[PDB]
Amino acid sequence: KGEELFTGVVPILVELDGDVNGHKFSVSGEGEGDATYGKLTLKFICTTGKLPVPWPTLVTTLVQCFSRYPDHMKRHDFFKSAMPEGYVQERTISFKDDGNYKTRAEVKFEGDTLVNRIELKGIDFKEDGNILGHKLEYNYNSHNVYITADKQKNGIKANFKIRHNIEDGSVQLADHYQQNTPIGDGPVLLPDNHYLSTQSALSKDPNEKRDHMVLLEFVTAAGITH
């Protein structure tokens, strides 16, 4: 079981290459995750200088396999069942009244560590919009990630809207259309309609001088009573 790969603490690596309205950049992340608690600890760093977009807009893109599934619903955990071969995660993130990101990533074990390699492309973003104008507050709110089975793809789909608070007191919605596919050929677990109660907390390393992001998250599956 890919399940047995998460009984303890697992090292994590995240590599991301992006291009937003022609502005290229890269961010690396490292840390560890504990699916038993459903928690992650991660430090991200923009290795190409300043991040051309706000850090929060990248949170969802930057390993739901570290979600905590209650004992009664461990059969709905597609994420772990696809390990160690892993899965492909794709998304179309539409910022209300602004541009959109299209992401494609692979989440699989590479040795003793879980790695999330991402490629991101954004287009049609407004010059001085909330995104390119850095008008989002440096924080994050709680969201429910609704998952449904995608039998034809032998994976899953996810649909949700991220709420990014703007410094002007308004909210910038970020519609998310997710699609996950197993990498290997073996059978996986096609969960029932449920969601992931995910929370994130963004902070900074007063000692780090590079553009970065300290992220702590807690995810617990739910929606299926028992």
Place this chain on the structure above:
Amino acid sequence: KGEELFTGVVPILVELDGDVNGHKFSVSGEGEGDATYGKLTLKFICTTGKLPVPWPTLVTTLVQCFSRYPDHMKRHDFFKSAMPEGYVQERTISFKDDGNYKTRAEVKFEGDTLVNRIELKGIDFKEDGNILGHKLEYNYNSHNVYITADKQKNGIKANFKIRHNIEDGSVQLADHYQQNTPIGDGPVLLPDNHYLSTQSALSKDPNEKRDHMVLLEFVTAAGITH
């Protein structure tokens, strides 16, 4: 100087006695805070059995002295300046279309540990409202705490509205009116209009059988340009 008491890691003790619509309960919390980073780590446990109200409703009540104040605005940090004697923190939490909370706490040092002792009274709550009916999700969102000086009372005031996500996709608002006053006779610092950008993340200790809540907080002061 009070500020000098927060340069490193500080043990935290929290004791709360509550009474909502006649239901008495108590919660004990322990952990630590590091104002250099502006983070806290606490574990609360309902010592009287099960909490009669949803845990998220008690978050704001359960030590803003642990907020991180940037170097350019360290003279606006009232909380630390009142230490070690501490300050009284009082609040009136009005849940929209439902009952309200009235809290009085003393925040001060008891040895080398910062202690927050609270007394809470809740009234006119609906037997099957979001609160007593426990319809709140177990999560929390980001909020800005706007602080203003209160020369007359020789302290500060605070106003903000907490957004409590409901299990049916709706949102329950909790209007907060805060008032802080030094406990000692010693002179404190009167801030300039600014705010505390705060984030809270709720989780559960998988090995804890008692009714409890693990909380992770990140608070950074802002609003003052420089």
